[PDB]
Design a protein around this ligand. Sequence first.
Ligand SMILES: Cc1cn([C@H]2C[C@H](O)[C@@H](COP(=O)(O)O)O2)c(=O)[nH]c1=O
Ligand SMILES: Cc1cn([C@H]2C[C@H](O)[C@@H](COP(=O)(O)O)O2)c(=O)[nH]c1=O
Lengths: 202, 202
Amino acid sequence: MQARKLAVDGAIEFTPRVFADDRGLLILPYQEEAFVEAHGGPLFRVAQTIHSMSKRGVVRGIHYTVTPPGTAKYVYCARGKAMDIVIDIRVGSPTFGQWDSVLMDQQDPRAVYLPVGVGHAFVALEDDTVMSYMLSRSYVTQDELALSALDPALGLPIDIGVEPIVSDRDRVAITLAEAQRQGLLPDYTTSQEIERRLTAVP
Amino acid sequence: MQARKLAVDGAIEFTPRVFADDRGLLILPYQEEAFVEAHGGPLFRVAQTIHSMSKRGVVRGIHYTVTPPGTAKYVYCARGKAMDIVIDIRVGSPTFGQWDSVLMDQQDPRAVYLPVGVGHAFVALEDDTVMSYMLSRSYVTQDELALSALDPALGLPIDIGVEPIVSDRDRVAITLAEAQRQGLLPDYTTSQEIERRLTAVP
Ligand SMILES: Cc1cn([C@H]2C[C@H](O)[C@@H](COP(=O)(O)O)O2)c(=O)[nH]c1=O
Ligand SMILES: Cc1cn([C@H]2C[C@H](O)[C@@H](COP(=O)(O)O)O2)c(=O)[nH]c1=O
């Protein structure tokens, strides 16, 4: 497993080796040693998992959790192909307002660790694209907020030549700048404090 | 999410609801609240995950970890279709020697919790079948043992109309009864002690 720090502070791309034999293939998308090496502590305790399947051209996001309590996440693409996007919405972060992207496919699988307090989006590049997540806390509707992924300010890589397929909640989402003004974005210091508790060495 | 106790003591089948919209489908394969209700405590700390893809007719198993240290697992089928099999190989268990099976498909997805000490096997019923696991301990080759899945004493449902595709290590595995005589099986009491430590609420 190789680890590469993303441009959004604390976000990490992991590239597992793919093992093949006559029966099929194997990857180990999360591995404690590689994770600790890159992050400095183990994964959060897992509260919930997600299996999301999307049609080509679906854009989901930008999703974040009200912080506190916040949510950290670990995601990979288990089928199909996605452009995964991390957006740093943590006020005070050295990388506030920046994003980075990871192409997730089946030939060269990559997983991403999303710190507490960041935003997540993706676009499905193929039908039957599965995004598989581990979360640090169960999804609670009242704590789950959204920002506009289509915000021309951000210029996210979410246009693939079809009209995007977007939910109501994502379509009407306010922009990053509007959320900031309203006091709705996570604070970087607070986010890192929570994150260090979640990923503390037992 | 609904939970159902399997015939192997402590093994549990979870049935998440399938949510659908214009974008696709969503299931939540692992959910802490349902898990805690059924098991009595939260999932183990996740040491490692697995993404395994198999051709139709592959049979993997029966696999178990030397106990101690042992491994508990949580598994679901993220693509394709599998017959998932849990085998109680824990000497002293009230359900020793029994197995149970769960059909894992895309239409009515099911996840299974495998206690410490039990054996696991599955048969892939479609090409490109993906089994997705969370593990309590990282895989260590020297601790990963096998038992014969073809054992006539068990009658596992593993031939589906094509010549089974089996690894050499699985093909030459000894039977459950032989492994018991050789002293190679997990002990139930020990397994339960490990399990209680892993899944403690504190
Ligand atoms: C991702 C997720 C969504 N949901 C629900 C909330 C919404 O009613 C619906 C779609 O959510 P979404 O707008 O975040 O895609 O599914 C959960 O209950 N738990 C989850 O983990
Ligand atoms: C399942 C698994 C297998 N392996 C290795 C051991 C073997 O050399 C090969 C196949 O293992 P298997 O016979 O248990 O399927 O993959 C790992 O290193 N980590 C894992 O988690």
